[PDB]
Design a binder for this molecule. Structure first.
Ligand SMILES: CC(=O)N[C@@H](C=O)[C@@H](O)[C@H](O)[C@H](O)COP(=O)([O-])[O-]
Ligand SMILES: CC(=O)N[C@@H](C=O)[C@@H](O)[C@H](O)[C@H](O)COP(=O)([O-])[O-]
Lengths: 223, 230
């Protein structure tokens, strides 16, 4: 609960489990999402990233650790996907999210990014900016956004984007490392780069993706 | 021999990753419907074989996927260290449940039924036999009995301090002898599972890194928290 720098002692050095199964998968169901949320809490995870108004609602009634809410939408006239409408923001607040993350890139979008960021702050929830570049974070800071993340770097590669984490951290930002941290050792280099916490999704909660990671290596060797 | 021969299975499995779908016991994810869902998912993602635990999980999974199942029943007994399929009644249930290969503990330890009789109960079903071995002698014994598959499953799980890195030497030793070798145990990343194939394994079984969310979660927090306090 309550102020941002209390959230920053709670999240220091933590791994944040982004529970977003593959779309269309047999695993892409609210029950299995809640089950994973209950499970990672028992294993010591202190925070989650959950996608979908009704997934946030289901998970928030079953766990106690903070939830970073998002909604993903494939728009027909824009590349922005992560929470592009204030009406999504309002649902995420109602659903029980502690932080609401949004795409903070300077691209074509149905509603200005200043209004999304300011609509989150209105909720009472913390705001986290999903950034693609260092200057996305400069914009986010000027708008009163509590959290900046490297979520969108490279999605506008294969290794994480560590220098963005270094720049955000030595800018004084409350920095969330997110994107391609696929082993515990890459997530440790994130914290040492100055990130307060690190978000990990595919390596933890996308079984199809990780399965293909192994078969790719074992089949390639099988000559 | 439901419809297959040994060398037909070994080309089907060559260079493949075998997904061990065994949630943590008592976990919210340890449900049959969740196990079947995970089984359907890895098949859709291209996995060619599974290890499934529990007679009724084997039955449920075999009715929903098409890839072969290596069935086991694991029991923690009060008077024996053997865990992997220690009873003849377990073998018969796994065959009826639809498993193609049945894995058993092949170690020379205290056990309710001799390892020879277990192996012979598998053959009676018609299923292929996979020996879960702890030492090279265990696979050599399995060789003398006609067991089709030998695995490094039990290497490091007989003593006290249970290891962290895979045991590549036993996989090489089983491969050097001409055995049809399955590398299994502690292959937790795609490159270590690749070093297993390069070590001569036909296929490789991976469990915790894929289907134990609690375990992998603790793997990350252990590294981020330790640095996060430094
Ligand atoms: C582009 C986009 O939508 N990125 C993320 C949005 O939340 C999402 O796809 C991903 O799960 C997180 O970044 C977690 O990171 P990773 O561990 O999956 O790489
Ligand atoms: C000791 C024992 O009973 N081991 C296996 C039993 O079937 C099982 O617990 C283990 O997950 C597999 O070896 C898969 O290997 P890994 O990926 O979990 O390391």
């Amino acid at each position: 609960f309550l102020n941002i720098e209390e959230l920053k002692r709670f999240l220091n050095g933590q791994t944040v489990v982004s529970i977003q199964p593959v779309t269309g998968s047999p695993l892409d169901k609210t029950d299995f999402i809640v089950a994973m949320a209950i499970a990672v809490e028992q294993a010591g995870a202190k925070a989650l990233r959950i996608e979908g108004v009704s997934n946030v609602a289901a998970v928030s009634a079953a766990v106690t650790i903070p939830i970073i809410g998002i909604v993903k939408r494939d728009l027909p006239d824009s590349p922005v996907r992560i929470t592009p409408f204030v009406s999504d923001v309002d649902g995420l607040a109602n659903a029980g999210a502690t932080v609401i993350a949004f795409d903070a890139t300077n691209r074509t979008r149905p509603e200005s990014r200043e209004r999304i960021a300011q609509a989150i702050k209105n909720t009472g929830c913390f705001a986290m900016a999903d950034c693609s570049t260092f200057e996305d974070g400069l914009w986010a800071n000027s708008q009163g956004v509590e959290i900046v993340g490297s979520t969108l770097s490279g999605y506008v590669p294969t290794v994480p984007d560590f220098q963005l984490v270094k720049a955000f951290s030595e800018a004084g930002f409350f920095t969330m490392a997110e994107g391609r941290y696929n082993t515990p050792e890459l997530a440790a280099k994130a914290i040492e780069s100055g990130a307060v916490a690190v978000t990990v999704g595919s390596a933890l909660t996308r079984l199809e993706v990780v399965t293909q990671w192994f078969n790719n290596a074992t089949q390639a060797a099988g000559e």
